[PDB]
Paper text:
Here, we performed structural and functional analysis of A. franciscana ATP synthase to study the molecular mechanism of mPTP inhibition in this organism. We found that the channel formed by the A. franciscana ATP synthase dwells predominantly in its inactive state and is insensitive to Ca2+, in contrast to porcine heart ATP synthase.
The local refined map for FO at state 1 had a resolution of 3.3 Å. It consists of the c8-ring and a-subunit (subunit 6 or ATP6) that form the proton translocation pathway, as well as subunits 6.8PL, subunit 8 (ATP8), e, f, and g. Two native cardiolipin molecules (CDL1 and CDL2) were found in the A. franciscana FO domain between subunits a, b, f, and g. CDL1 is located between the subunits a, b, and f, interacting with the α-helical domains aH3, aH6, cH1, bH3, and fH4. Furthermore, a stronger density of the e-subunit C-terminus was observed in the A. franciscana maps in contrast to mammalian structures. In addition, the C-terminus of the A. franciscana e-subunit has a different conformation; it is more curved and extends towards the c-ring lumen compared with the ovine ATP synthase.
Residue numbers in the entry:
A (entry chain H): 15 to 148
B (entry chain N): 1 to 219
C (entry chain I): 11 to 47
D (entry chain G): 19 to 59, 66 to 232
E (entry chain 7), F (entry chain 6), G (entry chain 5), H (entry chain 8), I (entry chain 4), J (entry chain 1), ...: 1 to 75
M (entry chain T): 3 to 84
N (entry chain R): 3 to 106
O (entry chain K): 1 to 132
The structure:
Amino acid sequence: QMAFTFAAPSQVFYNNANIRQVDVPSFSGSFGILPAHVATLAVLKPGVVTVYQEDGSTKKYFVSSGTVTVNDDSSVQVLAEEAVPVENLDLQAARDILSKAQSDVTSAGADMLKLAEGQIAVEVGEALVKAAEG
Amino acid sequence: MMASLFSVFDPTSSFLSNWLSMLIPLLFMVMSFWLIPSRPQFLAKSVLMGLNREMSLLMGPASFGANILVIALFLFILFNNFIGLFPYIFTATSHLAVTLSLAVPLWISFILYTWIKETTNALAHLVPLGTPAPLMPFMVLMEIISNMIRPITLSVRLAANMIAGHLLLTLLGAQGTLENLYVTSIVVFSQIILLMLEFSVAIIQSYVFMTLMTLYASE
Amino acid sequence: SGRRGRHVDFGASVDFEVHMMRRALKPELRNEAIKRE
Amino acid sequence: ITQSMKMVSAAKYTKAERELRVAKPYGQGAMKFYEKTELKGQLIIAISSDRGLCGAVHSSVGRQLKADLAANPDTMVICVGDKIRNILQRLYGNNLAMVCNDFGRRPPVFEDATKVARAVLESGMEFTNGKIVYNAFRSVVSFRTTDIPVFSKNAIESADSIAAYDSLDSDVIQSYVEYSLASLIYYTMKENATSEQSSRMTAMDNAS
Amino acid sequence: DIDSAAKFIGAGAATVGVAGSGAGIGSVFGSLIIGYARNPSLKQQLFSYAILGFALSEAMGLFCLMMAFLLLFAF
Amino acid sequence: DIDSAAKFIGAGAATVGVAGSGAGIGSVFGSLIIGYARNPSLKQQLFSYAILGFALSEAMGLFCLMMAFLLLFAF
Amino acid sequence: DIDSAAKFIGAGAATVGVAGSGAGIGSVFGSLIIGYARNPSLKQQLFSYAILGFALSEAMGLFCLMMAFLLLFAF
Amino acid sequence: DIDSAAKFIGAGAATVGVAGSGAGIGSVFGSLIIGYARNPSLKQQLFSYAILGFALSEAMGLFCLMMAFLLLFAF
Amino acid sequence: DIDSAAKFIGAGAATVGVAGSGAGIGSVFGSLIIGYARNPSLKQQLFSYAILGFALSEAMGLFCLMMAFLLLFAF
Amino acid sequence: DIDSAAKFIGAGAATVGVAGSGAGIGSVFGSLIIGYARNPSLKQQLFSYAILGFALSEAMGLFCLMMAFLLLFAF
Amino acid sequence: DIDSAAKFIGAGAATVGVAGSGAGIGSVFGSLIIGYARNPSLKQQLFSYAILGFALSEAMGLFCLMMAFLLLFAF
Amino acid sequence: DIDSAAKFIGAGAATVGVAGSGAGIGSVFGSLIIGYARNPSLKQQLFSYAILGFALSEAMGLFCLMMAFLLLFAF
Amino acid sequence: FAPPVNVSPLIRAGRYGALVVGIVYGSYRFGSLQKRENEWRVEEARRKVIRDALNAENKAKATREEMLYLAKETGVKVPENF
Amino acid sequence: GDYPAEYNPKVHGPYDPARFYGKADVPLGQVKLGELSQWLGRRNKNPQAVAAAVSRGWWRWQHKYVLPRKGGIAPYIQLIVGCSIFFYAINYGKMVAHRQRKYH
Amino acid sequence: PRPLRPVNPGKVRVGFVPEEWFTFFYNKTGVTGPYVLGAGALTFLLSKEIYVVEHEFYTGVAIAIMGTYGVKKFGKQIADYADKGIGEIEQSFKEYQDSSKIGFEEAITLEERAQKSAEAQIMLFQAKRENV
Amino acid sequence: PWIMVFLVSMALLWAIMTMVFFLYQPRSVSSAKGFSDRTVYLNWKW
Amino acid sequence: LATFLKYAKVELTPPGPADVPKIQEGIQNLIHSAKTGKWKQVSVREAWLNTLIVTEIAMWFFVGECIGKGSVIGYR
Amino acid sequence: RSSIDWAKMAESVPESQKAMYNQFKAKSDGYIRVSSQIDAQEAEAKKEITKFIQESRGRIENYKAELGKLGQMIPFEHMTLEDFFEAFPEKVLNPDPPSPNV
């Protein structure tokens, strides 16, 4: 009885579809969403949003960012920013982005802004490296 | 490790008895003369105004004008705890008349005001909300005993924290020598740490008594 | 985290996350995944 | 040239209505949180393009802005489009903070909505309520002008209906607003970029 | 004369049992703090639940105190 | 008359298990405050489970009090 | 006779070990409240694990009670 | 003889119960820190409820201390 | 006849320590409830950590029980 | 001669009540860690709250240390 | 035989620090479960902190066990 | 002899605050795990606070052990 | 401070007279009370040894009576020596 | 608790409680010691008079150490040390009973 | 004569002792006079066991070390915080009398221009007689 | 002497209450702002 | 601490071997006055200064007694 | 060959407070292209002008008295609470309303 909406700004995967379970890696810690979940709004962090569909088949999707919104009528709206599945990921590009981010962190020095962006890209690189190995 | 000492609460030390050890807040009273205040007067005014602004949400309509009495109680506790910890001034709260006058009559006034004005509130505050019929009598008896002994517990606590602090300070001082600089320095350092702990405990105790007084006046 | 602490809002964090997420689609999908602006 | 530009806008209608097959549920699912909290309310956002010969669409936006000026005159307006700034300059140049330019000649993406949201929230102006007036898309031959009510961090923190929403603190609500506000703007941009072209194709057809 | 002595020791040992009631009262009021920081609009219900929990824990502590005062006098 | 003294000491020392009942009661009702603050629409099931937890904690405390009264009046 | 007397004292001391079992029951059911407040559709698995926690702390309580009975009689 | 000896033993036993007071006050102020991590605008009411819980836990512990002193001197 | 008496008293005092094992198992499995409430799809590792934590706390309780039996039938 | 002996046993029992102070200090500083994880910009205020709780927990411990030293070399 | 009897009593009453060690190990592993449910991407660091906390808790228990053995045998 | 025997009993009864030390240390490091799961970029400050809490709980345990040794060789 | 002027020779003369008289008086009193403390310490040690032996015998009898009372109360066996 | 009967603001001025508005008396530090007994008998010895003199001296101390603008911690340290000295003079019976030396 | 408020309090030596107690001895024994007197009085009170070094003396030392540390650390912060508020009260007070004098002079021109209407009222009826 | 201690503590509390009641800084804010809003003018005859 | 030592160098010198008539003249001036007058003709401040000077002089007796007995705090 | 001083007549009124001049300004514009009543009104207005002048003189004297009171007041630097309660008679007295911060 869950109305799940997974909608990237370029692809719409689920449009108020009926979904058994939604796992979402957020800044509030990774949590699993079931029907009649609590109303809670969460801010997405990079990682695999794995969807347990009602037919018994589970499809995993990465998210770059976004927001998770659980509603009191048992309806979720995960509005990602980039989302393509774990099926299409290139491990070497993730490792190259991670190495570039670490180089930017080491060469930032006193630049607090470049250090912050390097830390963000380090988080995304670790998440992509972890996700592409499945 | 060697021994200790006691018998410091004597009220008959000399002809000029220890009742002058309670008037020392009058020396530390801030007496104001000029229009533009002095530094201690302005600091005291800032402290009291901050306390009034913090306790404004707990006053209530019944004791709107009684905040001055609560602030005087706070200053009374603070001066009897801070100046009571100085080494040659005896613990006034060791004799329980001070804590009796500090705690008991305001509770008697509040419980009489409750019993006269709102008897329904007096009979309903004992019974917890949502309590069924077979869970009544033990709750009634336990709450009656606890509420009839609660100001006594507050007074004995406000005496006993200072009693424990002064006993531990005297025990640390008595176990300190003079010929050994290491042992004396360790004793002095431990008394510094214990005195910081006792000063913080005294301030927190005065604050919690003020907050309890304001919240009970709100009732 | 360290994002907001360095006077960086969530829009810039979103932009960096989405750029690094688009860039991990080399052999077929970096061309058809980014419309640029 | 009006008949010749009729099929030019059809290519820019087929690349703005087909592009609305996935930009529409992204905006419906964004407002579903606002559909449940049900808050009532400043901030005014105008959506247009930097191109002329648009008929009366920008005239309709200016008419709606003139109507909005009679309700909350203390509003600082941030517009997507230089034409609305040029129209409203003579009216309220004292209350023009910034207007985002370079829009309309290319189909919108999310980066534009993110930049407009950052321009809105990084100005330091104090706002609680708000709305984003956009020319919604109903049909090819005619459309409807509506708006989406926008809200700030303190508007949803002090809401009576947010108490059912848990696992919240200052950082989560702050970080939720500056992506939801960047998602509603993307819904207003993608609907407006169809209405500003589908109603221009017939304005080129009316002279054809 | 060992009977009165053991009544004294049993009274003290029974009065040990109020410790868990003090700990439970601390737990219920600390969770009143952490349950009032989240959803402050339910203050009346949360304080009612705090009063009920404190009353039950105090009932346990005074049962221990009653078993201290019962051995000491009536047993 | 040593054994009566022993029974008094055993009763007083067996009445310390009520501290655990007090602590468990405080824990379960503070967590009732917590779990009612978040998602307050489930007050029926929250209060049902909290009364169950209180019943079992009070059962442990009454088991300890029963063991005290048996150590004093049965053996 | 002092052997049976110290048996009584030993059972009185062993009955304190049920306080932790009571506190464990209180903790497991209070966290059942907290865990049912968030995502309540897992009620059956949550209650099965809460019953498992109740059983595994009642095991410690019954161990302490059996030690008290064994010191009183079997030892 | 052994009456005053057991007065000392019973007082030393009965003053254990302030351990629960210390644990309860620690739990109160720890959860005050947690409840001030989120929503710092409720500082006055958080401090009020924390002071309430501290006072009640200290009341239970000082009830243990009061019973210890009553066992020591007045009997 | 006083040495076996003290063995009974010491064993009864030693078996208090299983209370801490009971409270530890209670906190472990209450945490299992809370941490399975969110992330239901992690139960194969949450339950393994719960099994390990229960095994360690119950192992400390069994070591305390072995200390109790060493004061009675080994020393 | 048994009076000083029971003073030793009473002080040994009286020093147990510092255990609750230790547990309270641990809870205060652990919750300081948890509260510093969320909104770490409140570092000074949360450390002030931690010191405020720690002082009261150690005051509860000093109550039992005072009762240990009153039995030992003062009564 | 009196002094060895009191050695037995002290060794039995000193091995109840294993209670607090069990409570600490339970808290460590339970909060390991709670903190692995939320953000499982730090599993090795979370388990290393759990090993550190369990080691220090068992160290505090082994201190009391060492005092229990060295009261009965050495000092 | 009865004075040295009671010193043994007092030392054994004094070696109980190590339980509170162990419970506090376990709470500190479990909350370190929890508060490192959320906002893991603060490993240094979180571990500093865990070290501070562990040090103060160890200080309480060492105060109890120092009283245990002073009740056996000095007092 | 202010520049110093020499003290008029009554404070200095009386000061050093008291200083030297204090030195010699302290030496004489220290010697006399050292002899007095030696003899007082010797006689106090003698009477303290006598009193300590008497109190040790009295306390041994008191501990014997206490152990007999403890045996009669607790019901334990009464040893032939205690 | 009002102004003393020797003070009239039309003649004297604003009220300084540390002032004596009565008869212009010989200062205490200039009595030639031959008339010092008559000087001590000149002052009234009622409790009202000694309380007025004590409050005058106390307000002179306030005017020298507290009521100035840049008042420091020196008056309060002075009060603390004076109170410790006076209460040691009170508790001298208890202090002399314990001591450290036995002959001295 | 009216009392005057000095900026600085009485001169204090050795932290709390009045300076006048030292300068009293300058006509007899200069500078080291009062210090020699204080040292001799301290050695006399210690030597005769009038000033008993008991357990309280090891608390007054611990009070004085913390008392010196607090004054030598927070002394300038608290004094500057307090003296800031004294000026702000004067800043509140100097915004009263200065504004009242200028405000009264503004109120004079309100009364002066009310006379100017009466000055121009005469020409009003000399301006309506031209239309006839 | 407990009644004497009660009376001494009560008198000290009354003195502290009177001290706190009188411990305030009076400020003068009755400036000439109200006089500027009294621009009384004479009307004209037509 | 240096300036205090310079002041002590100036104002703590023992009386010299050449000013004995001057010190004895002052002693007999005090003796001849106090038995005839000049003590009921001295102001309270001046007499208080004289008594405090006498007390400070007398303190050197106790300081030299502590020198001449070893331990300062009493005898041993 | 007739005209009036329009500048002083316009500057005399406070514009909107005496806007009936502006209606008269619109009337008198068209006339560009009962005398005994005006003389009687001149006499009445002269009497009212004298009354308003003496009232304005009284108000000016009161304002001068207030300024002299402010000038004769001692400064707020070397002033006491007694001098403040003398110069400002608001005071805190026994028959006063009770307030926490009086």
